Design a protein around this ligand. Structure first.
Ligand code: HEM
Ligand code: HEM
Ligand SMILES: CCCOc1ccc(-c2ccc3c(C)cc(N)nc3c2)cc1CN
Ligand SMILES: CCCOc1ccc(-c2ccc3c(C)cc(N)nc3c2)cc1CN
Ligand SMILES: CCCOc1ccc(-c2ccc3c(C)cc(N)nc3c2)cc1CN
Ligand SMILES: CCCOc1ccc(-c2ccc3c(C)cc(N)nc3c2)cc1CN
Ligand SMILES: [Zn+2]
Lengths: 412, 409
């Protein structure tokens, strides 16, 4: 079965996927089970690495329309000799850039991929220490932020060698707010970040103990113990959240940071593993997790918004949760737009993704897409991705999950 | 292998063993997942299918290996030998029909699966008799607004040239007419079937909420038209608890969702006509796609009457009007005492249902893509619930529309 077809049930457009033939790794599904809603369903040896590097180099020389050329054959022989004599190899700058852009292009869960070719790639493979990691990360944050006109970027630190000298960013994102578990069980700040917050304090961080404390960077170079650094506050662009109609919404005291920069994933290119590779874009409004904050000793933001809206909160069928959720998302978009900080709403983002997906089917022969993650977390059926059938499969280069470094790190 | 499913809000982990019993394919492979794709016998093949079903029936009544289990297997085997098919016992039909619902991975309403009223219509021979059985189904299931789940099962497929079919997609739906300009009077989802009914002799009233006639096919014959008696069709005028102008939109909907175009498979037997009904979850009610005027959706018109800024999508006017429409649907059914469930309560019930099924059955096949409601997904408890999807039998299946296969006479 060389071709697979997907249908859009609103428009009746049918697209034909051949790209899936290049899929490399297992999905977790079988002919008898689907694991599509499952969150996640020793270094490479010499013999394991030869074919993975050849596949990548072949793909690279095809993309630049030099497949089979003298340069292609010479590059292949060079890589083969490096693996034979050193058990690994080094990517050229061009291949690194190509590989990072294509890991984004291949990210089946990412709705923002129409932008994939504009990624700014910062080569930090000469970095040797956590201070140098901090320098690279500050420059990335400053460049990507661009005074609110956000630019997508990735910074790539040295690849894994024996697995005992890994570079890692222990933060899950470069910018996130601390959370503090109180003795009485309540949470101050962002509840998602309580474990990592406790690690930072344990490493020596003196917490301000506020609602929106930007966490320090915890940076690990060359397998050494990680080191704490404070991001300069002038580099952290933030948006106060207010509402175009509800005067009281600003009184909730909410703000969010402008730059989503995920820093705990692994970038895999040609069998090489870049365990420190923070990448950033701009937000879709629904992602901003200000909803889980506590306004007082007992109430969510969602509950507190509904209470200030004078909604009936005794029955679920009044849809007070739905009403409040819409208004919170209105406030997020209004505030970012008012402050001229790049943000995209879920209608625009999904409409762009469908245009992206069609272009990729036409020009590339397919587009791996994970419906469970592409459909936004609200108003699903009124966005164009809901009635769009998708095929999910794993192409390389790719971004991958990796274990939390505190679970594996051997402390010096 | 046992497979774990995790809820990422509660951290509850359930262990799935039931998927090891599934025998039908899902469409996915090791290299490609097709979870968002909508649609991914002979004498010689029938008895293994029948044996598998008879086995699980007698296992379910804790009489596996019993004398009656063996005799029934011997009876079914002889009957396939001599007649190329077999007939289910009344008890087996009821078990089979209930477990087809129990196994419907896309249905969020399955906490109710064992309370299903099963109507045996296997003695039916004509479209007039189908009409009678269907009228009795509608009347019983409607129950003056205290809706009750029911299925009516017509005779099984024989050689494939004598199928019983309900040509309607639901027992009760509104007509939809192609307007001279291009807009739509009535339900846009039903324009094609409406044209079929008009071609078949139906005289259309050409309003916004014309209940379609039943188009009924018995024994492979040409289908016949019938008008459901209007007093059997319970309807709810849609109004809003805050917006007094909502009732001026003139919208209404019918109370009884009764899907009639799917195929029920039990023990290798195929029941091509088997309309089943329950009650609505409010988000299902497709009143959103109606046209108020010559150019505007109900969604666009509701946003207008709400005085929202409709020039930019980031004002979220679509999301705001959608919530208000769904508030009005629920308020209206509740005000008229017609059974309805909101998507918060329904998904909460389904999580409890999963817990029950993992405890007593070792798993629950679930299709996340279809279980998560079409609005406010992540603030319902199913969003963060991992699910395993697999195909068990008895099951409800899709089948082609009869007007693509039927040869007229
Ligand atoms: C430019 C604007 C971008 C937007 C609007 C965007 C949007 C999104 C959204 C909404 C998600 C799902 C979020 C969730 O479920 O919580 C996502 C996931 C993801 N994005 Fe993008 N994204 C952008 C840029 C990027 C870039 C620059 C990269 C990498 C170079 C990237 C890689 C990924 C990956 C790997 C995932 C999946 C993470 C996982 O599997 O856990 N994105 N994106
Ligand atoms: C009792 C109240 C019930 C509720 C609230 C309910 C709810 C739902 C919903 C919301 C869907 C998906 C809707 C959509 O995607 O448009 C669905 C699918 C389905 N339901 Fe239920 N349901 C109920 C009863 C039943 C009964 C009694 C049966 C059969 C005996 C049944 C069989 C199915 C099947 C087979 C599907 C999937 C159809 C397909 O795969 O295309 N449901 N249900
Ligand atoms: C905790 C389970 C959810 O996992 C997730 C969920 C989302 C993303 C993610 C990654 C990159 C993004 C970029 C560059 C821009 C943007 N607007 N959004 C992003 C969202 C990562 C992970 C895993 N680190
Ligand atoms: C270790 C991180 C814990 O946080 C987590 C953990 C898990 C999920 C989660 C789980 C299931 C999802 C499904 C089925 C679809 C989707 N589109 N997204 C999901 C996101 C989010 C968060 C963030 N609260
Ligand atoms: C048109 C594409 C989607 O297909 C669908 C979508 C939904 C259902 C369905 C079936 C039975 C239901 C019952 C008994 C109650 C209820 N409240 N809802 C139901 C919804 C069927 C089909 C197959 N036609
Ligand atoms: C011939 C029937 C035409 O109507 C149709 C046809 C198709 C779908 C449809 C398509 C894809 C869906 C996905 C990926 C998830 C989900 N949860 N639901 C879906 C429903 C609905 C309708 C109802 N308008
Ligand atoms: Zn799958």
């Amino acid at each position: 079965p060389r071709f697979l077809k997907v249908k859009n049930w609103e428009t009746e457009v049918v697209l034909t996927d051949t790209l899936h033939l290049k899929s490399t790794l297992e999905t977790g599904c079988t002919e008898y089970i689907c694991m599509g809603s499952i969150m996640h369903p020793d270094v490479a040896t010499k013999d394991q690495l030869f074919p993975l590097a050849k596949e990548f180099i072949d793909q690279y020389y095809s993309s630049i329309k030099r497949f089979g050329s003298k340069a292609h054959m010479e590059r292949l022989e060079e890589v083969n000799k490096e693996i034979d004599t050193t058990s690994t190899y080094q990517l050229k700058d061009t291949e690194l850039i190509y590989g990072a852009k294509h890991a984004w292009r291949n990210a089946s869960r990412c709705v923002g991929r129409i932008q994939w070719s504009k990624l700014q790639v910062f080569d930090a493979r000469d970095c040797t220490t956590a201070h140098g990691m901090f320098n690279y990360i500050c420059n990335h944050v400053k460049y990507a932020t661009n005074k609110g006109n956000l630019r997508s970027a990735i910074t790539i630190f040295p690849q894994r060698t024996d697995g005992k000298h890994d570079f890692r960013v222990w933060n899950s994102q470069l910018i996130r707010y601390a959370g503090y578990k109180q003795p009485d069980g309540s949470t101050l700040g962002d509840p998602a970040n309580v474990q990592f917050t406790e690690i930072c304090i344990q490493q020596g961080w003196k917490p301000p103990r506020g609602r929106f404390d930007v966490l320090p960077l915890l940076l690990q170079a060359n397998g050494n113990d990680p080191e704490l650094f404070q991001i300069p506050p002038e580099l952290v662009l933030e948006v106060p959240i207010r509402h175009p109609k509800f005067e009281w919404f600003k009184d909730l005291g909410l703000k969010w940071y402008g730059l989503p920069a995920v820093s705990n994933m692994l970038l895999e290119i040609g069998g090489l593993e870049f365990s420190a590779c923070p990448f950033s874009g701009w937000y879709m409004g629904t992602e901003i997790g200000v909803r889980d904050y506590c306004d007082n000793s007992r109430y969510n933001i969602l509950e507190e918004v509904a209470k200030k809206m004078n909604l009936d909160m005794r029955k679920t069928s009044s849809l007070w949760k739905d009403q409040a959720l819409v208004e919170i998302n209105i406030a997020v978009l209004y505030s970012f737009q008012s402050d001229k900080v790049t943000i995209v709403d879920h209608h625009s983002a999904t409409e762009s993704f469908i245009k992206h997906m069609e272009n990729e089917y036409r020009c590339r022969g397919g587009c791996p897409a994970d419906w469970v993650w592409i459909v936004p977390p609200m108003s699903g059926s009124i966005t164009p991705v809901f009635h769009q059938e998708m095929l999910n499969y794993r192409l390389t280069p790719s971004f991958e999950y990796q274990p939390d470094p505190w679970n594996t790190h051997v402390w010096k």
